[PDB]
Structures are given as C-alpha cells and as structure tokens.
Design a protein around this ligand. Sequence first.
Ligand code: SF4
Ligand code: SF4
Ligand code: SF4
Ligand code: SF4
Ligand code: SF4
Ligand code: SF4
Ligand code: SF4
Ligand code: SF4
Ligand code: FES
Ligand code: FES
Lengths: 583, 583
Amino acid sequence: MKEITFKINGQEMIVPEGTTILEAARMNNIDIPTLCYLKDINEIGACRMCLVEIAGARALQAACVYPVANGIEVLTNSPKVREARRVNLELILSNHNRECTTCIRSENCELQTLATDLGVSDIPFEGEKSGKLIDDLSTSVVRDESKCILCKRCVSVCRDVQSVAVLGTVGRGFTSQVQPVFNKSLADVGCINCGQCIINCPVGALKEKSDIQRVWDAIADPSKTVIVQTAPAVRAALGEEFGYPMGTSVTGKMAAALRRLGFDKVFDTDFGADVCIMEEGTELIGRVTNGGVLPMITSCSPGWIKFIETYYPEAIPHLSSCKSPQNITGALLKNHYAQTNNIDPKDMVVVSIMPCTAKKYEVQREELCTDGNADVDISITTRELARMIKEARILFNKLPDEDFDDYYGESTGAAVIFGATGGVMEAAVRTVADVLNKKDIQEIDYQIVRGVDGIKKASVEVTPDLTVNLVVAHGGANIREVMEQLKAGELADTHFIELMACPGGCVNGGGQPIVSAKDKMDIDIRTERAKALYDEDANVLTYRKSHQNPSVIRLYEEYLEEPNSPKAHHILHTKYSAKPKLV
Amino acid sequence: MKEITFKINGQEMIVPEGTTILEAARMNNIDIPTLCYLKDINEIGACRMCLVEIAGARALQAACVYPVANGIEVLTNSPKVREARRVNLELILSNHNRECTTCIRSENCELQTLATDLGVSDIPFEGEKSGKLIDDLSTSVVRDESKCILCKRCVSVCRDVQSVAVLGTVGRGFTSQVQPVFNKSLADVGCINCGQCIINCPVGALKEKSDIQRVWDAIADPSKTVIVQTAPAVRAALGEEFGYPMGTSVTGKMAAALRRLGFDKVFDTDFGADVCIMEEGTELIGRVTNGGVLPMITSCSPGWIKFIETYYPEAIPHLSSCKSPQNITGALLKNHYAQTNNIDPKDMVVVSIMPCTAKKYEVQREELCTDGNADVDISITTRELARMIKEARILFNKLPDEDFDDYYGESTGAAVIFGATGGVMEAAVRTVADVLNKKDIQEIDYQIVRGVDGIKKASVEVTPDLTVNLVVAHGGANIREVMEQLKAGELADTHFIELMACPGGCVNGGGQPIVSAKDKMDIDIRTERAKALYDEDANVLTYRKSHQNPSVIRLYEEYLEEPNSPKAHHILHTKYSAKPKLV
Ligand code: SF4
Ligand code: SF4
Ligand code: SF4
Ligand code: SF4
Ligand code: SF4
Ligand code: SF4
Ligand code: SF4
Ligand code: SF4
Ligand code: FES
Ligand code: FES
C-alpha cells in the first residue's frame, strides 16, 4: 500500500494508492456535485459536472474519476469552474423536458437539485430535443426517452450487478440513445424485472407500471370486499418517505392508516409464509427419505425463477413445486376464508403491498390461479402506496397503533426475518431441526467465500445422522456464478441454495423508496434496514418458531391435514415451464 | 359560546361556534389541501382547491371558509371530489409557467407539492398565458407576473397587517392582475420594504433583489480585503435550511463556514449595538436635563423610519439622530480599523448579513456616507446567504466551531437580545439605571393593552425621582395606531417607544427563510426563535450588561472620548429629510 501526499485548499493529506479526490474531499468535509458517479459501480467520467482547477493543467479535469497524484495543488472555487458548471448545466438542461410538475421523481430529481443549487436562472440556448418514443407496452418497466441524460448508470447496473445486460447504446450524436436490442420492447427480451435499473436512475426516465387507477376502481365497488395484505419489509423503509430517521417501525400506524382508507380486512402474508415453511420442510423430509432431486432450491422470489425459466431450463427438476407465500396466502384467503364466510370467491378483491416489482409480471401469469379463479388481483409497490396515502393525505406522523386480524395476522420472529437475506432458510432449518431432532438453534455461522462477497456458505449438523449443506445467494452475478457451478456439478453434496436476484435481500428491493447517492456514500441502507428488522425480531415475545404458532397448527389440523397431501398438492403445488427466449 | 355537533367520516365531534371544518379535521388528524388560506389573515375561498362533499348539497363546497352546522355529514373521498381537484389543478397550472427548474422557490413551491400530491398525469388544456412584464426596477422587491395565480395573500397582508395597501386588482378575465397603483413601479409609490409580501407568497411570483453577483465580484478582488458582518438573528432560523429542528445554534459552525468561503475578517454587530445603546442613553440624559423633544423613538429599523418620513413628516423632531448599529459598526471599521491598520479606506469592502430587506434601500441612500466613503458596500439576506453557501457546497452539518475576531466580535446578552422583541429598549433602560442609580434589573413587567395584541406598555422606576414610560410596538397596524395616538397627543407622558416594522421583531423579518402554512398553523416560528434567542441569552457568561464589556470601555476611552461629543455627533449622528410621496 503506497502513501500519496496531496495539498488542497489549505490542507494536506496522506492517502493510500488508488484514492480519488472526490471521496478524499468527502472525508475532508468538502462536497462536489455528482451525476454519473456511483460508488464502485459507474466510474467513467461522462457526467462532466464535477470540474476542479488543477495546477499546471491546460484545461479543467473531472474530479469524479481523477486519480490523485503527489505534490499537486487543487482549487475548487475559481471563476472558470463556476462558469463552466453554469454553461454545462444550461447545455444539458436543453434536452430534459422541463415540465417538472409531472415527473414521478419531481421533488428529489438530482438534476433539479443541481439546477436549484447552481442558481442558473436563464437558459439562453434553444434546441430540438430527441424523438419522443414512449414504450408503454411492457408489464413492469416503462421507459421515456424525453428525459434521459445518458448518465449510463442504468446500463452499468444491468450489465455488472445483474449479469443480464439487455440495455445498450446506439447511434452517434443525437442518434445516440439507450435501447434494448433489436429495437424491441423491454418485455420482448430477457429482462428479469430486477428493479435495480428503475431504482438507480437519478432523473426519472424510468417508471413502474402504475395500477393505482385499478385500485381506486376496486375500492369504489360496494359489492366487492377488499382484503389487503402486508409484507414484513414495508415498515423497513416507508418512514423515510415522511422525514423519519432510518429505522422506524410504524406497524400499528400502518394498520390504522390502511383502516382509514376503508379497507374491509387488513392482513399479513406471514401466515401462509409459515405454511410454506412447513411445506418445504415436508418435502425436505421426503426427498431425504425418497432420494429426491438434489440440491434443493426455493421458489420464493419471482425474479430469479423467471431467470431460470428464461436462461437455464436444465435445472427445472431442482426447483420447489410450492407456490409463492403471496400465492399461498392469496389462495388460502380465496378458498378457506370464502368457505367460512360463505361469500362468492369472485366477490373478494385481494391487494398486496409487496416490494418486488417482478410480482407485477408474476400476477399476470396464467397458471397461478386456483379453480380458474384469480388468487390475487392487484399488486402494488411501496412507492405507489406512499403516493396513494399522499393523495388521500392523512397526517401520518400522529397516528396511533392498531393490531391485525384473526387469524392470519399473527406473527413469529423466525418469520419476521423474511425481510433480510436467508431468514427464510434460517426458519426452514430451525423448524426441520425442531421437528426431527428437537434441536434448538438460533443462528447459523456462515463461511464467507474469498474473493466473492454476498455469497455465504454454511453447514450445521441438523441431526447427527444428517448434516445439511447450506448456501445463501443474493445478487444476479452471484446467481450466475452459483448456477455455473451447479451446472459444473461441484455442488452435488449441497442440499439448500437460497436465491434472490435483488442483492442484499428484499430490504434492497425495487419497490423500496428512492434514495440519493449521498446517503449511499454515507451509510448502507441495507445495513440499517437489516438492523431495524433484527431489532423487530428480538422483540417478538410470542414465538420464535413457526411450527409452534397455534394458528398454523389449527389450520393444519382442521383443513390442511398434513403437508404433501393430495389436497395440499392440488392447491399449493404447481409446475413451471421454460419460457421462449428472444435474445 | 355555542356547542356545535358534527358527524364526519365515522366520528362525531363538538366545537365552539364559528369553528370551520378545516381545523376540526386538523385536530382529528385529517389534512385538506390549502392554497389561498392563511390563519386569521386570508379567508376568502378564491383557491377553490379544498372541495369536500356535503350531505344534501346540490354541488360541492369549499371546506376552507365553510362554517360547520349541526347534524351535518361530510365525505372527503368521493370520486367527484378527486375528479374536481384534478381538473382544477390542470386548469390552474395552464397559466403558471411550467419552467420549474429555475424558480427561486423551486423545491418548496406549494404548487409543486400539490401537483405531486394529486399525481396529475398531463395537462391537455393548452392555450396562451396572460400578458407578462417584469418590473425589474425597484430597489428591493422584484415582481414577475407570469407566475402569479391570484392567491390574494399578498394583497391581504399588505392591507391588513401593514396598513399600507399599495397593491390592488385590475381588469376583467385575463386582464385581472395584481398591480400597484397607476401602472407605476413598486419603488415609485409608498412601499415600505416590509418583506412580508415576499415571505408569504406560496408560488414564487415575488422575489428579493439579488446582488450575489456583486458579492462574487467583490470577493474575487485580491486588492480588496473583505469584512463580513453578522446580525444576532442570523442563527435563529438558519438551521431550518439544512433540515435541522427548530432552535439550533450553529454560530461557530457559521464562523467556520464563512472562513472556508475566503472572507478575510468576520465580525459581530453586538459591539456597535452596545455603542448605539450608549449614544441613545446619553441622548436620554441630555433630553431629560435640557428638556429635549419628547417622546423618544429609536432610529434602528430602516422600514418604519422610511414609513414615518414618507407619511408623517411631523415626527422628525421626536426622532433620534443615531444611525443603525450595522451602519455605526461599518463606519467604525471604515475609520478606526483603517487608522490602526494603515490601509486606504477604499481598499476595504464590508458586507453585512441582515434579516431586514429595507437595508437594501438603506445602503442606497446617499446621505449615509462618511467623508465621502461608503460605510458598507453590499447587504444580503439570510436566504441568499443560504443559496451562496449551498452553491459553495461545503457539508454544513459536520462543521466544528470557531470564535470571532477582536475587539469587535465580543458579545453581551444585552446585545444578544437585540433581535428579540423589546431587547434593545430593555438593555437601554437596564444600562441607564446602572449608570444613574446603580439599579440592577433583569426583566420588566409589561402591560398588555386590551383589544390590541402586539402593543406593549411598561413603567418601572428608573430612579426614585424619574420613572420612564415605556412602550414597544411591532406590526404596521400597531405603528399606525400608536402614531395616530401620538398625533392626538395622548402619549405626552410617554418617553420611549420602540417601533419594529415587521411584526414580532426582526426574528420574523423578510430575510428569514421561507416556511409553509403547515408550519404556521400548529406552532409560531416566532415563539421558537424567541426561545432559542433567550436560551442563548441565558448562556452568555461573559457579560449581561453592555457597559461592563472592556471592549466598549476601551473604545470610548481611547477613540470615542465621551458620548455625544462633537466628534461623536459628526461621525455617528445624522439628519433625515421628508421624502416626496407618490400615492
Ligand atoms: S428531471 Fe424529471 S423530475 Fe427532475 S426536474 Fe426534470 S422533469 Fe422534473
Ligand atoms: S435511465 Fe436514462 S438517465 Fe438514467 S441511467 Fe439510464 S440512460 Fe442515464
Ligand atoms: S429490470 Fe433487470 S434485466 Fe430488466 S433492464 Fe432493469 S436491471 Fe436490466
Ligand atoms: S430480494 Fe426481494 S424483491 Fe429481490 S428477488 Fe428476492 S424476494 Fe424478490
Ligand atoms: S410555481 Fe415557481 S417554483 Fe413552483 S413549480 Fe412553478 S415555476 Fe417552479
Ligand atoms: S404574490 Fe401574487 S400570486 Fe402570490 S398571493 Fe400575492 S397576488 Fe397571489
Ligand atoms: S414591501 Fe411592504 S408595503 Fe411594499 S408591497 Fe410588500 S408588504 Fe406592501
Ligand atoms: S422588524 Fe426587523 S426586519 Fe422588520 S423592519 Fe424592523 S428590523 Fe427590519
Ligand atoms: S460526477 Fe465526476 S465525472 Fe461524473
Ligand atoms: S384553502 Fe382556499 S378555499 Fe379552502
């Protein structure tokens, strides 16, 4: 490690080799504007915002990608720098459609914050913006080309982080635009509905498919009763919308606010989640005792199973036949609650507040229906629920707390930890150990693989006669790596591999509220969300295990008999088919 | 008091007579959109944004000015209400220029918040705007009629609370615009530079005169050294810009930030304020001992003295020849500091940070010059200081603290109370009692006059042979009332009256940062600012009395000789002439 000495603006510093002047000034309490810069993701120098005077330099240099050097002098407040920033913002703003009353981003468009910050009132230079081509055809992602700034963040994210890379650049000059391949639509190619591309864009050129009109139409029907259900991870970040500090639980406030909307029933996805935990435990027991297809993987997140269908069909024996916890609880409410309440199943409308955006495509699937009836009707993301609350506009900061409904709102901590990565797998191994060997484990040690961060390996003795190999995976690149190893066959001994496309778990999902870059250089939002969720876990004083909850025991005794029954297979078990690829 | 029962949205409530529905919903934790409503100021129903359904009503009614009645039923989320709100936003935005990148208000324009809140899709209803012209001619206030939406808050403020009313409405249809009288400019009529009209406008149609370009030109000069001057009320509300809670002191942080800006010298006005208090007290003693013109009034705030010379020339003999504390400090730096430092008086540039906007007109006055030299050069408000430091872009939330330079940065609590209501006169009577009778008083009981709030009276025995009558006034209507009473001669026995043009004192001045009506309904920002300033006063552990400060004693002994000297009169005392009126 080499030590570099540099002198800026009255202060000298020693830094390691590879240091950039930007985060060096950040550490030394100086801020420089950023558009195209992301920490360790997009470092190319296309933004052309961050100019600083360099001693001995013919012209200005961009501080974003500028490596430090020894003995240099840097001054950041010359008149040339200010004039260059003003003129360059005037140039770049002549393309972005200036009707900022109606952008979804609106208040936190980083371009708008820069525009106000530089105080550049006038725009002397006119122009002819590029062609307006609204791609309002796909299922989840909507693109608008009248806004895009060629920041290149979206393409870098979809190339590196997700290892999919269905976006590229075409043309030259004004003809240069970001497009999918073959001039098709997003849904016509192998897009995974990752949600990272829509969350990382600093302008609002991308938006999600809005179904709030359908929601208002559904709630407007007196003949239709509404069943709303909640994720464990909605209270992980929603408080950030209302100016609350990171890590606030508003669960009772959320229930009260949803009741003020006039929803007939409020409920949690937790109960069916415990049901499917019992499920995967049951076919674990079966595949152990019958030599089932191994290694086993879950079927929780729609995104990566979509990826497996699209790209690697050869692992289709390895998937779990179970349907998603969303799908489990949706079918459960549409059947058992309907039987108890003696109401026509078409007379219920079920709405879900989930953070994945891939569920928008997942609900559109033909085969996720029971008895020809829709298990769930409308799925919505956290951001658009927030805007629904804002258009209703109840002062959220003074709500009291409320409880959930019988029976399917009850909670357990091992099912609270669904929000973080591997909590599903933790609950599964804890429950199967409790069932088979009466073993009381709370946490599992994880082996961090050298050179790859985000992949986690574990192996704990479930029974003295059977030690189960455990692998955790989040991040599309990690999925690609572990799938390549699985095709190579070196994971033959492995038993469970848990996968989601979105890195860091659902707290880092596509439906989570938008955050800027500044807080990302400060604090990992994943870390604070995980701490808040784990603190919520430690406070669950009713049950830390799913199989001990009296509600799931009641349902199993009365209506579900045992898992892997013919009724259980017919209602909760499904098959998947490979999808045609257009790549 | 009559009790009214009303049943809204599933809950019944009792209110006193005259309690309209909006605050009834507010205390019941329900919010309704407001544009044209202000608490106790503007109740007219022009906005037509706050529509709510009423049982048995042919059409919708505006909740803003709708009185409650017994046995009514109110529904707030019918589809009719939503469609009406959406169409009225679509209509009203068709006139407001949609160039929201470069409004001064920008981020916190209430129209932007409403536009995002209602989630308006597009504006199909095109056309042309009203005729436009920018009156970029007045000294302080700048108008842009292309933006304004006929909220009528500005005209109500300038009519009621200021008792000036130089704004009105003209024309029919599109020709209906708010304008001054006789198609003139703002500076051509009896405008007082109140600043309330600037602070209260919820759209950004009004702004202050910007001189940041002159500031950057001045600081760019190496041949000119810069001395910056701070008012005590600057840190009363600066923190609100950076997301800090109400009542945060960043004084040392401000000193550090200013030093990072390249200012050569920093100084606090408390020294000159103490000198002015001594001069006023010496004039007190002289007019008592020589039968001077009574009652005594200050000459502190430029606004009200502008009002007096413009409207009531008969009060000139009752006025005090002393200049404003910032002006006296500027002259002192122009003469005594120049003598000590042996630097040519034109080679200094002095910039002042005032919460008044009337100082912009005040510095333009030709009579306020010493020896043909400009006492102070540039004055800027707190808001544009925030803008200049934001574009300077140092991360203000992690700055350490710094001290002020000698001998003119030292402070006393008697000068800390300068910004608060009545503190100047408090310090004056405390110091004169200390000088003449060695009387130790910390606070004086005040008589609140019945029927008028903001007019404040006291009479405590300064000496057993002389009790001084004490009156404090803030608010243009209160100024008008006390001036009318003075002309009637009812205040013959009175000795001191304070006149602050902006209501509530300079802590509520035009230079303070913009706040929204949501802030104004629940809490008075004046109250929290006064509490912060008084807590700062209680922590002043160096001196609670001006005349015990060694710095003022040194300057009086070495350079100022005795107060009310011929040199003191020639340097610190001035005459005012009546200005022609065009009303
Ligand atoms: S980039 Fe989009 S959100 Fe930002 S100011 Fe422009 S239109 Fe508004
Ligand atoms: S969406 Fe547009 S602005 Fe955002 S990264 Fe992609 S190309 Fe750049
Ligand atoms: S959804 Fe995923 S695959 Fe599709 S463009 Fe975005 S990041 Fe790429
Ligand atoms: S992290 Fe969450 S949103 Fe992302 S794929 Fe997994 S379950 Fe879906
Ligand atoms: S009213 Fe002014 S500040 Fe508000 S959006 Fe329009 S232009 Fe921008
Ligand atoms: S400044 Fe103009 S737009 Fe604002 S309230 Fe007054 S008249 Fe209406
Ligand atoms: S500065 Fe004062 S007098 Fe002039 S328009 Fe504003 S409120 Fe009225
Ligand atoms: S109250 Fe304050 S801001 Fe208003 S005129 Fe007086 S000193 Fe200036
Ligand atoms: S912000 Fe520095 S090059 Fe992008
Ligand atoms: S807020 Fe203006 S009419 Fe009600």
